[PDB]
Amino acid sequence: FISNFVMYDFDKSLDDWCRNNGITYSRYADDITFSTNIKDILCRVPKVVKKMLSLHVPGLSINESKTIFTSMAHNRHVTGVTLTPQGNLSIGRDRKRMLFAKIHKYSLGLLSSEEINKTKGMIAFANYLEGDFLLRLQKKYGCELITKFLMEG
DNA sequence: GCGAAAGACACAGATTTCTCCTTCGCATATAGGGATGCGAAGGAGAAATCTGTGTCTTTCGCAACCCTAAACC
């Protein structure tokens, strides 16, 4: 809470500078992200943020070895959630096949009791992030098995 | 943010080795005498390599933590 209260002026000053140029800005703990649609406009902000940091909170500085540029032709994610080119949030294909294989192996009764509690939390998180994971699972394995798995333990 | 224990950075100074500077001695191509030129040892005084001192740098397994699942810092 103290850190959030401290970085108020920096947030306020950077917000109205980015708004006037059509750039979206957001900060999470000590991570800062910018995004836009205009070409060749994101190459000017590294000097601006440095001037703001020096002016509004003395002492802080930028780690210059963790700066990233990306577009629609490569992998895109924001703090652990993937953005498909269509414009929808996602968890990733590898995790989807992770869970589909785990549940299929569970249907044969070859899963330890620890992995049931392990997978239940991940399934709940994925359902919250997506909103339609449980429907797809029911449409593939049937409601009887899923309900039995859910009430297990 | 930074324990103990080894290096990097900057600044002196010291020393053995060597290379330039006398000094007179010689010599040999010209019938003895004199002269342009080169060789031999001291005697310097210059220079590259080495060595020594003082200020930082780095980042500990660093009395005093909870025990259900997932993601983030």
**CA(A53)–C1'(B33) in Å?**
100
**CA(A108)–C1'(B50) in Å?**
79
What the block records as the tokens of A147 is 């309900």
**CA(A63)–C1'(B5) in Å?**
29
Nucleotides of B under 7 A from a protein CB: 68-73
For this PDB entry, the determination method is cryo-EM
Task: Count other Cβ atoms within 10 Å, centred on residue A151.
Answer: 7
Dist CA A148 CA A151 (whole Å)? 5
**CA(A59)–C1'(B1) in Å?**
15
> Which residues interact with strand B by a CB < 7 Å criterion?
A 28-31, 79-80, 117-118, 120-122, 125
Give resolution in angstroms: 3.1
Which backbone phi and psi does A18 adopt, to 5 degrees? -75, -30
Compute the radius of gyration of chain A from its Cα atoms: 22
The H or E element spanning position A24 is strand A24-28
Dist CA A102 CA A111 (whole Å)? 8
Closest CA to A138 of A129, A128, A122, A127: A127
